[PDB]
């Protein structure tokens, strides 16, 4: 229907719209993570700064998928952004575990999104996921994996000194 639409399936178009909500949802969880560590009874400044950067990164991932849908001739369909599943995080380690479990879920959705472009014989869409999303989802999971293993080696979350020093040396 679009004048610039060529080799673009409806299933690929609908799968991009679903991914846009998944990145918008992810930035909402990172927004709720950042301002939990800004609380007076938590008071971890570099933990709040770290999750604030993650919030603005998932927003640009949703904006790049919104931009890709326009070049391919697709039409963006927007839905509700659901609230985060947890309104309280136990500690800094528990937040890094819920962020590692979140990135692995985002990476899983991209793998089947890449598996749908291949089935549809859409080579431009396959290269867009590999260049902008597949490579950065492995560094993100690896980096969060390092952060979690460095936290429970110091004795977190039982050791409040462990969270404070990780917040200073690693995150700062």
């Amino acid at each position: 229907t679009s004048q610039v639409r060529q080799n673009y399936h409806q299933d690929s178009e609908a799968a991009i719209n679903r991914q846009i909500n998944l990145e918008l949802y992810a930035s909402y969880v990172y927004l709720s993570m950042s301002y939990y560590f800004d609380r007076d009874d938590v008071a971890l400044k570099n933990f709040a700064k770290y999750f604030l950067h993650q919030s603005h990164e998932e927003r640009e991932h949703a904006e790049k998928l919104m931009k890709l849908q326009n070049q391919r001739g697709g039409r963006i369909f927007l839905q509700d952004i659901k609230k985060p599943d947890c309104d309280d995080w136990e500690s800094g380690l528990n937040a890094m575990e819920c962020a590692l479990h979140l990135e692995k879920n985002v990476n899983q959705s991209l793998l089947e999104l890449h598996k749908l472009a291949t089935d549809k014989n859409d080579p431009h869409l396959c290269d867009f996921i590999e260049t902008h999303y597949l490579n950065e989802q492995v560094k993100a999971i690896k980096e969060l994996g390092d952060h979690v293993t460095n936290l429970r080696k110091m004795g977190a979350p039982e050791s409040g000194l462990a969270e404070y020093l990780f917040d200073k040396h690693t995150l700062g």
């Binding site: 409806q10 719209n17 679903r18 949802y25 369909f77 609230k83």
Partner: peptide, 16 residues
């Protein structure tokens, strides 16, 4: 939990 609800949604709910 909320992540799998969006992920399992059929593609017909994401087309205009």
């Amino acid at each position: 939990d909320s992540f799998q609800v969006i992920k399992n949604s059929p593609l017909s709910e994401w087309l205009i």
